[PDB]
Nucleic acid binder design. Structure first.
Ligand SMILES: [Mg+2]
Ligand SMILES: [Mg+2]
Ligand SMILES: [Mg+2]
Ligand SMILES: [Mg+2]
Ligand SMILES: [Mg+2]
Ligand SMILES: [Mg+2]
Ligand SMILES: [Mg+2]
Ligand SMILES: [Mg+2]
Ligand SMILES: [Mg+2]
Ligand SMILES: [Mg+2]
Ligand SMILES: [Mg+2]
Ligand SMILES: [Mg+2]
Ligand SMILES: [Mg+2]
Ligand SMILES: [Mg+2]
Ligand SMILES: [Mg+2]
Ligand SMILES: [Mg+2]
Ligand SMILES: [Mg+2]
Ligand SMILES: [Zn+2]
Lengths: 98, 66, 83, 239, 90, 99, 101
RNA sequence: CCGGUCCUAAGGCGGGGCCUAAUAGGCACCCGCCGAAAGGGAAACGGGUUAAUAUUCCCGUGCCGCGGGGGUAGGUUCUGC
RNA sequence: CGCAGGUCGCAGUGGCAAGGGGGACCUGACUGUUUAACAAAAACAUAGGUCCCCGCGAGCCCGUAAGGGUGUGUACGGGGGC
């Protein structure tokens, strides 16, 4: 499975939300499908994501790289602490939950 | 010394004044209430000034021209 | 008196008096503002310049007041909610 | 007069003493710490050989410890027998797995830690003798010693290594480091002295001294003091 | 505006029935306008000052303050003489 | 190689004093000390601030940590790092082993 | 969605920080209307930014635009009227500057 | 309302204790205190006056600490907006 | 800050203020310290090198003793030589 390539497909086809603050808003107020958090996320940012995700009943996948490599896997030129996949437009990114 | 801009607020201080001093200019008059703690000063129009001196004299407050 | 003015503990201020002279006044420097107990940064609403001790400084209307900033307080409350 | 400098040092004059008021306190284990604590500060201490960490224990006791390499502000450390052997944790020597790297080892329990306290130094837990309650560890000098298994040591190596690798390029640089330490700076050679002042002082071509026995009295006990050997041959004989 | 903090305090004070504090806040609002405007004219920053004076005219209408109108008239007169002397020399 | 010099770059403040060998050692250590390092937490390529010897601070994520005297991580210290900061590598194994 | 009508929330900022309240309305994504009754917990009925509240795991059943008395019967039905009376106590000693950077 | 006076620094002294043939000799320990007219640190400025004092006297206008009275906001099971 | 033109003296940084320069040998690397009152040096120190005593109840030193310094330290360290 190519996490990045599917994320690029879901980036361009469906709806993916970039940034920790948008993700907390999309977890708290929206209904996302998959949350991806970088492995090297800080303690406050990690535990905020799991608690809102545990309340929201949304799964979390821990990306096997850092925030920088997560951003490169999504083709962005910056870092990405956490993202929400609201719509997998053509990708199989929802396979990561299992 | 303190400066006050509303005559309603200054009347509360000036009525208790031991002495009210008056300094006259063309466009305004300086009214200075000398209390035990502070000296309260207001700048009023000349027409307002002779009015304020009038009741303060009726309140028995000393009015002294400087 | 005099060697207490040759040290830089006070501020040398020059002022022209109504009598036409120029004199040097020696005034105190301000005391440091309250800081947060976590980051050490100055606290909003309590950081105005104060030059003598014994002056009351009204803290912001929040729990814990002028002890921690709003960032430390809100985050700590989040931990207590989950804990 | 005639007393030499090493005899004058023992009087405790101000130029031979440690300015320990420049530090916040001893870096020692409090005798009664256990549970979880937080690394609240990491500080430079004048005259010391490593960065120092301040630990805010869960119950509220705060103590000073030498910071292991990699320790960071806001980290959670474990102290006690039930702690895991992770870096920065304070554990008894009995519960340390063999081959682990430790520092600030306590020879006996409660003294606060004696060995492996300089920057970049560590002690290796070599073996265990639980019957006599001793732990065999190799000190930074290479000496293998037994310590109390109930005693406490920290996991990891002391931060600040490589400090002595950089030269003290100017005499002024070593001057400023001496003022936070106890050393008298600078030092006059013995043979640059007169015979009243040093055993080596004197003659028209001044010379050093041959070694003195171990039984030599103070004032005569300078130079080589009962040395096993000297020079490169002594280094070879050691190996 | 510059003295908007005093406007909100007056309505908050009057809403809670604090006639005394509303008067004190009314005095502070007039002080904020006249003092800041009077400093600008002394530095002769008439563009900054006139923006404050125009705001003061609205506030006196919005709050029924004659003393703002009296003091604003004094400041506008000073602005006229400053601008008049500038035109003469220039 | 350096901004205005050829070989004595950081140690050019010493001029022609102290000897070529002494100044050469200074250039070797100081180039790593004043270079770019990866913060052990956020992994950014940033010039870390050395508060004192053995104390390093990341200006991006604010990570303050103990390291080497002149370099943020010694060679031995890079192996005995805390495993809380070894989470990226831990999950990297669990992605490979599980797939 | 977690921040939904009938959810007990702890306000984290402002004068009413640490107090408990219940969401009764939703203004938009950025705002909701909270009211833990001012007699009960100390929170007046007003809009709050969703970033200034912390949701709890406890939720109740009330319709949108629920009145303040409706929330009181709901919380006493859940037996949470005492839970709405407590205030959250932070532990500032556990916080480090890394948490708020 | 200018300084000392207060605080502690590097240090020091005294009592107890231990040491000492002994003390007017030593001090690691306990207790108290001293230790800065350049460090920390409450609060006054302008004018006038004398042969000689002048932030000290006199005029005017204030500030600090301590205490009291009145009014006010507030409180009076409970919470300020 | 620049350009063009004119012009006076023996002399225009006109007074004041204000480096003579170069080659070579010995010597101490350098900055620094020194015989207050006949010696400022090539002497001392120095960074660097190396050797020795030492795992701390150590090693070395002070005190009649009580005890103390190194030591609020721990071999990337303390002390002692060259
Ligand atoms: Mg002083
Ligand atoms: Mg000061
Ligand atoms: Mg010294
Ligand atoms: Mg000689
Ligand atoms: Mg001999
Ligand atoms: Mg001799
Ligand atoms: Mg000889
Ligand atoms: Mg004293
Ligand atoms: Mg005189
Ligand atoms: Mg000359
Ligand atoms: Mg020389
Ligand atoms: Mg010289
Ligand atoms: Mg001489
Ligand atoms: Mg001479
Ligand atoms: Mg020499
Ligand atoms: Mg050499
Ligand atoms: Mg030899
Ligand atoms: Zn970082």
């Amino acid at each position: 499975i190519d996490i990045g390539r599917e994320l690029q497909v879901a980036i361009n086809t469906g709806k993916v939300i970039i940034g920790l603050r948008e993700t907390k808003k999309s977890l708290l107020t929206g209904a996302p499908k998959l949350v991806i958090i970088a492995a090297n996320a800080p303690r406050w940012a990690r535990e905020d994501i799991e608690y809102y995700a545990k309340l929201a009943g949304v799964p979390i996948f821990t990306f096997p790289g850092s925030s920088i490599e997560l951003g490169a896997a999504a083709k962005r030129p910056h870092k990405i602490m956490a993202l929400a996949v609201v719509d997998p437009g053509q990708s199989e990114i929802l396979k990561l939950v299992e | 010394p303190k400066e006050i801009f509303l005559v309603e607020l200054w009347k509360k201080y000036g009525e208790k004044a031991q002495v009210v001093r008056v300094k006259r200019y063309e466009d305004f008059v300086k009214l200075k209430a000398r209390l035990s703690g502070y000296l309260y000063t207001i700048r009023v129009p000349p027409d307002k000034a002779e009015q304020l001196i009038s009741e303060l004299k009726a309140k028995n407050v000393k009015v002294e021209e400087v | 008196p005099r060697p207490a003015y040759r040290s830089r503990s006070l501020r040398r201020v020059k002022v022209k008096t109504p009598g036409g002279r120029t004199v040097v006044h020696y005034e105190k420097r301000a005391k440091g503002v309250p800081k947060c107990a976590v980051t050490g940064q100055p606290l909003g609403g309590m950081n105005s310049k104060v030059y003598r001790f014994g002056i009351s400084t009204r803290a912001p209307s929040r729990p814990y007041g002028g002890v921690v900033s709003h960032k430390v307080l809100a985050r700590a409350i989040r931990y207590a909610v989950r804990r | 007069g005639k007393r030499i400098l090493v005899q004058r040092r023992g009087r405790g004059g101000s130029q031979f003493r440690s300015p320990s008021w420049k530090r916040d306190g001893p870096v020692r284990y409090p005798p009664n710490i256990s549970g979880r604590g937080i690394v609240v500060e990491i500080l430079h201490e004048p005259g010391l050989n490593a960065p120092v960490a301040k630990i805010r224990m869960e119950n509220g006791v705060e103590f000073f410890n030498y910071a292991a390499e990699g320790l960071y502000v806001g980290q959670v450390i474990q102290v006690g027998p039930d702690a895991p052997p992770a870096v920065g944790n304070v554990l008894p020597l009995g519960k340390i797995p063999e081959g682990t790297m430790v520092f600030n080892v306590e020879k006996r329990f409660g003294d606060g830690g004696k060995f492996a306290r300089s920057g970049g130094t560590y002690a290796l837990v070599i073996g265990q003798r639980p019957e006599e309650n001793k732990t065999i560890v190799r000190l930074p000098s290479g000496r293998v010693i037994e310590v109390d298994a109930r005693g406490r040591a920290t996991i990891g190596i002391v931060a600040g290594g490589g400090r002595v690798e950089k030269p003290f390029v100017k005499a002024g640089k070593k001057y400023h480091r001496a003022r936070a330490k106890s050393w008298k700076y600078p030092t006059v050679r013995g043979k640059a002295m007169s015979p009243y002042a040093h055993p080596h002082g004197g003659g028209s071509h001044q010379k050093g001294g041959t070694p003195v026995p171990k039984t030599a009295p103070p004032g005569q006990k300078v130079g080589f003091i009962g040395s096993r050997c000297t020079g490169r041959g002594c280094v070879r004989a050691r190996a | 505006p510059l003295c908007s903090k005093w406007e909100s305090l007056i309505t908050w004070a009057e809403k809670g029935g604090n006639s005394y504090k509303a008067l004190e806040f009314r005095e502070k609002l007039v002080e904020c306008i006249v003092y800041t405007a009077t400093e600008k004219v002394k530095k002769k920053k008439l563009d900054e000052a006139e923006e404050l004076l125009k705001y003061g005219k609205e506030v006196a209408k919005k709050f029924n303050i004659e003393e703002l109108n009296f003091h604003i008239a004094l400041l506008e007169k000073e602005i006229s003489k400053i601008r008049q002397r500038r035109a003469q020399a220039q | 190689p350096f901004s205005h010099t050829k070989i004595v770059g950081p140690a050019g403040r010493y001029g022609a004093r102290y000897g070529m060998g002494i100044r050469r050692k200074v250039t070797t250590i100081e180039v790593k000390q004043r270079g770019k390092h990866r913060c052990p937490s956020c992994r950014s390529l940033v010039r870390l601030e050395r508060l004192a010897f053995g104390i390093w601070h990341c200006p991006k994520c604010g990570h303050t940590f103990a390291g080497g005297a002149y370099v943020p991580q010694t060679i031995l210290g890079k192996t005995i790092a805390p495993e809380e900061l070894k989470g990226v590598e831990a999950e990297k194994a669990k992605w490979k082993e599980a797939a | 969605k977690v921040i939904d009508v009938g959810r007990v929330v702890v306000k984290v900022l402002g004068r009413e920080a640490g107090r408990k309240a219940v969401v009764v309305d939703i203004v938009d994504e950025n705002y909701v209307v909270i009211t833990g009754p001012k007699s009960l917990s100390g929170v007046r009925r007003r809009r709050v930014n969703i970033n200034h509240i912390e949701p709890t795991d406890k939720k109740i059943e009330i319709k949108k635009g629920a009145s303040d008395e409706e929330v009181l019967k709901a919380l006493e039905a859940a037996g949470l009227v005492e839970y709405m009376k407590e205030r959250v106590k932070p532990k500032l000693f556990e916080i480090t500057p890394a948490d708020v950077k």
